[PDB]
Design a protein around this ligand. Sequence first.
Ligand SMILES: CCCCCCCCCCCCCCCC(=O)O
Ligand SMILES: CCCCCCCCCCCCCCCC(=O)O
Lengths: 268, 268, 256, 125, 238, 238, 57, 57
Amino acid sequence: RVADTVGTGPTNSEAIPALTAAETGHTSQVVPGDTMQTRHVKNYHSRSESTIENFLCRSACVYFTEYENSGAKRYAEWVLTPRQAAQLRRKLEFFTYVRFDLELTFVITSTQQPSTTQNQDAQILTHQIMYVPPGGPVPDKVDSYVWQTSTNPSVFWTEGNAPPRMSIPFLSIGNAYSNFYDGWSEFSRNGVYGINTLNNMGTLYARHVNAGSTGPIKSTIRIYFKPKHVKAWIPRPPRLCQYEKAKNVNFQPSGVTTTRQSITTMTN
Amino acid sequence: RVADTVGTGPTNSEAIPALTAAETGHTSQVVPGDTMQTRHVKNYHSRSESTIENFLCRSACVYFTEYENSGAKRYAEWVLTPRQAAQLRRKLEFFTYVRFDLELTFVITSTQQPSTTQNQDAQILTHQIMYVPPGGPVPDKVDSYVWQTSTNPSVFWTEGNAPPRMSIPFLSIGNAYSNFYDGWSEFSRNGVYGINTLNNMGTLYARHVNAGSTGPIKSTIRIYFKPKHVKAWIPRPPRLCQYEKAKNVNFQPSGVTTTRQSITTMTN
Amino acid sequence: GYSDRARSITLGNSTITTQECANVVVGYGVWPDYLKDSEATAEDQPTQPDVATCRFYTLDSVQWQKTSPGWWWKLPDALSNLGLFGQNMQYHYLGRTGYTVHVQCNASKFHQGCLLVVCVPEAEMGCATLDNTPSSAELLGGDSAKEFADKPVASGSNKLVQRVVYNAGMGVGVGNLTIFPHQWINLRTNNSATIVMPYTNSVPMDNMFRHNNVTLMVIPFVPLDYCPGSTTYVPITVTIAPMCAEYNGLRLAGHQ
Amino acid sequence: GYSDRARSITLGNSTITTQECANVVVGYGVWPDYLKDSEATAEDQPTQPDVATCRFYTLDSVQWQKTSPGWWWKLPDALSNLGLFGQNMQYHYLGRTGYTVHVQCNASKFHQGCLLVVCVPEAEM
Amino acid sequence: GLPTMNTPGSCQFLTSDDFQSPSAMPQYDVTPEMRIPGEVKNLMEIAEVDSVVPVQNVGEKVNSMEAYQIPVRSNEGSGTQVFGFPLQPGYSSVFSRTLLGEILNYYTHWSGSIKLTFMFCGSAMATGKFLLAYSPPGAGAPTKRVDAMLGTHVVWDVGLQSSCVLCIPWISQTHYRYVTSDEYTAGGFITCWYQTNIVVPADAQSSCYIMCFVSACNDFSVRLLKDTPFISQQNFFQ
Amino acid sequence: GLPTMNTPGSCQFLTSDDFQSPSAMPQYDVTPEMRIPGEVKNLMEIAEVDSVVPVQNVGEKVNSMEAYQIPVRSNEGSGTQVFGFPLQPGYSSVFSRTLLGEILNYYTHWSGSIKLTFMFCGSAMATGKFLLAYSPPGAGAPTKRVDAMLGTHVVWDVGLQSSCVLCIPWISQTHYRYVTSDEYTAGGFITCWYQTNIVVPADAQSSCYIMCFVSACNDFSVRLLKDTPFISQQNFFQ
Amino acid sequence: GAQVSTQKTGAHIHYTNINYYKDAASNSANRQDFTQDPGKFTEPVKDIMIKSLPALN
Amino acid sequence: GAQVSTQKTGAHIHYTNINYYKDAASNSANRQDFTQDPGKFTEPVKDIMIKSLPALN
Ligand SMILES: CCCCCCCCCCCCCCCC(=O)O
Ligand SMILES: CCCCCCCCCCCCCCCC(=O)O
């Protein structure tokens, strides 16, 4: 609940609430009843939508990719990294360090491709999604043994029902996920610079378990993140500039803001 | 429970319950046992269907619109406004101010369009519906970045199961939704006149996430409102005339009622 | 002893006396009061002019003829140019007030007629051209009354109000206007009509120039009649008293 | 702690701040108040506009030159056309008020001069 | 996995259902409530208020204020009729457009007593006497004052108080009636007759008007919510 | 088998929902927490911090540090204007890119009072007086000091403490305003005028600069989370 | 924290309800609120009018 | 072991919740944690600054 205004009256004193000194790096805690006469107002507004948990706990698409039931591109791979979509990236970069659980949701949708093959009568498609932590083997092909998922987490989904969804705990060797890193991987102060140094999150693969039809089909998978139980530290200023790559903070210089006509104009 | 009639007998007195004066703007509270002899009746009828919550809490179609999986019209947009359907509009306009929660239900149905394309074997269609509050970006195209819904509420629905349904809280900067507004937007007493001045409700967009087939398909979405927890003030007379537009109270003059043959005729 | 016909109302430096009147109608059961602290929004301290603004302002008279469709007045606009009430509402940004409307019409025992007096909250009116919305010069005429019509207004490419009377400009049935606070002036019984309307709105305060909260409608359901030899000029007078008027947001003078 | 040079005055929706000022002069020892009942004469009820009339009105500035004899202002007339104070004094017959006059002139440490500010009651000329 | 079983009626959209749904805007601060005059908690608080009845809905009279006037003048005879209409509060054109009628249309069944108030709007020198009557069904409508005198009637004496009330009681075989036209639930007939005459002096108008107001009593009730056959549209409004 | 019934809204993906899901990594030991300075628990702890306002966003000045400077020099006159802009904390270019503005864009409604701090950055020999003003809507913007003096104003005397505060209070008809441009919820105008003059001695600069900082008071609040219209992308970044 | 209430039954049995969501805007409609007060509209006059009394005296 | 808490309702009702999984990382988001402390950022100085006092004395 926000503070309630206190009613004040006329004053003639040596107190100076308005006069301050901003060189001390301190924000003035002046209320409106210090520079004018006010009335008593009973405020009932709540700050319940400005909480970091409410500001960040909403699903967002961070990536989508395609694969086919025939031909060359038979499976899809994606090193996990949220810095490909602009919206969630810009929301998180408000802080230097964060710490949250994750809620993953996948929207898998198929489409029939144009072709001249006849007598097509497709059976329901089943998809497999597999997570490989850094260090494990990778699926060089579509029908390789790695898809046995003896230890690797994986989800089997048949087209036509509720989208698959899982919960991931805070996976980090450190005490918090670093949104920014000012340093290198090597002690020789050369090599990889920036936050790509701390991006050791694993890889996600996706395939069709059966081909379904005799004609071509392309399946697209969209990945959705949703932070839970969020903690955050050291707020930073917003990006302002437009992002360029997913591994670094590079930008093109942009003006402070948009302009107007004069210093006295009340119009954009 | 309605009141119970009291049994009365013959009277000869200077009391005058029948004689009153209607110029005082007061309705006479005369019961039938004031102008005749009655018997004692134990009434058990209830006024449980005349309540505003029961009168207004029923789903109604307020709009429907179409989009396609190919071609030009690839997505659908609709500024939220209930004054397009006559039935719910006329029910609400019984009062000057209302205040309610909302229950949204969507009936999305697809149809195959006539065409000469062959070997059509469609996969299940998934739809996305997205709400943009006033101020946010808009989807200029179908595959634009705005569909990432980082903060904007949205619903993913696969054809074949229960219709999507959500709950919306009373969203208003004021203390009640104004069904009528007698004024302008500008202090210059010119510009937009009427209730269009207070219509700052956002926009709803709808699209196909996948194309499904190689042939054409048109999907229609029907929107249903259902007020809950209703409060209402200052009852008004019913419309009588037929509505013309969605933004104003314009009408064509109509007779008070329908006619009969004479002042003594007992037939329509 | 005393009678129910006689009644005096004192406000400011104004006293209204009547010797043949019906009971007073008090709004929706509510008496106009001031805005409380648990219901306010604007933080600064408001100014209450009291006697200077809460008094009886009389308007021009209109003539009741044998063929008069009726009249209406946008209450806030009607007094926007009278005394210190208009000045306070011209120098401030937000305002709040209730009203006390007294309508007077006197005639003899050989005259007949019946007038409906109704305070309609948020009487949004319609245009004769479905394409546009009506002008401010058509809707609100200050320092004067606005007349209804007996026939429908023609369409075209203008911004005229649909002043047909049996539709009340609001596109309803006129006989239902008795759902709002109302009073009948019957020449054989009544003489005047008093209505004490409180502040109705969906916000705690409002700008008083671009929004009209209520509207006074006077319609003669039963026409005026008499026999040759009696008085032919019969006027109708309207007196409005603001009640518990307060103002917030002092600024420069003007309305733009 | 605080100093005697700094002083803020709040009236209505107006606040005056000063960082180099002398002590305030309060009339003849009396602070402006309202008319009491044992001292009134007019029988009807008066109207007190309060915040709308009791606030700081600034006037035009005058230039202090090396050869300026001086200036004067008839206090009641000066504000007869400003805000709601002028309107209330234009629609009424009798009025009663005290005043708070703040005169400001700033210059550097390399300027010199001295101005006398005096509130003269009933200065018949 | 708790073993369950789905019953007929799953994944169906019944428009009059009552469930719980996930909120689209979670943890949203709703604007506080303020006190607004005239809060409505039931539709029978509206139907219990008077409203003027258009009895003279004959010809072009519906396009004026003449529909609400009931003409009554000096008659060189006695016992003639003033007006008549049936007790059909939601179907007859006399009643289907009033506040009571309008609210009744949204429902299928109604019950309770009815109030008809009459206001005399002549001069203070006119005097009269009228005989308001209600006749339950079973015979026709009464065609003279000797047939209307036998029902539920009031004799209205005109003077000072210029307003009389005729209460139509509930005389039915069922608990409820139908809002639509149905012979099995016929209501009866309401008529008005001259008791003596309207008498005036010289230099006064021998033609006056009456006005009618209809409302409902405390026992009034409605059931079966339905759509009103008045409003209609061809395409979505814009 | 416990007999159940599915309701409308099953197998749907509402992005703002709150349920429980099976964990992919069961019985996983999470790294212990450590104490990090500067923990944030609300977005209004950030908006309540000052940030410099680019008032001189005119022409090429946006591509330098001149956007943040407000030029004030010695004037051979009096009562002229220094600057002016509208009270639109999230839509006007003066305010849309500051910490307050940035946070406001992610929401639809705002409420509360505003702080504008001004720092004078001349020499210790310069003296001045200024008249900061806020005018609620209803008229235009004030065009002279005789029209700005009538609103909520402060007279800033320049000396020693080189920083004054103008608090813009909440003067609205609604509880909340809109972050986007809407006439129904217009805010007002903020202007600054010369009270007397900037006076300097010889061998000192007669041209100085002022700086502005904006922040929110204790009563500030936001509602309706939405997407910001600033960030955008054409293809997935790499 | 189940809420047991009474069902709508004829004249001349209970049901159970549980709230599953933390937003009060998700609950079921308030169907049983049979409270009426027609006095704001039917009789809004300043002076009381006894039924068996001359309205004008 | 059900947990009954209060719902988010307007100003001027309860809900029930049960945990089904043994991993605390599967629970619902912590929406109602309205705790703010802006003193780390707005006023981080070593010496206290009284509002109605000259910042530099
Ligand atoms: C069967 C699929 C299981 C998928 C398991 C995914 C586990 C890895 C989750 C990666 C989360 C990355 C969070 C980065 C946060 C940051 O640094 O900003
Ligand atoms: C994913 C879709 C979410 C949709 C969210 C819709 C939120 C806006 C609801 C608009 C309600 C408008 C009520 C108008 C009432 C009135 O003024 O009569």
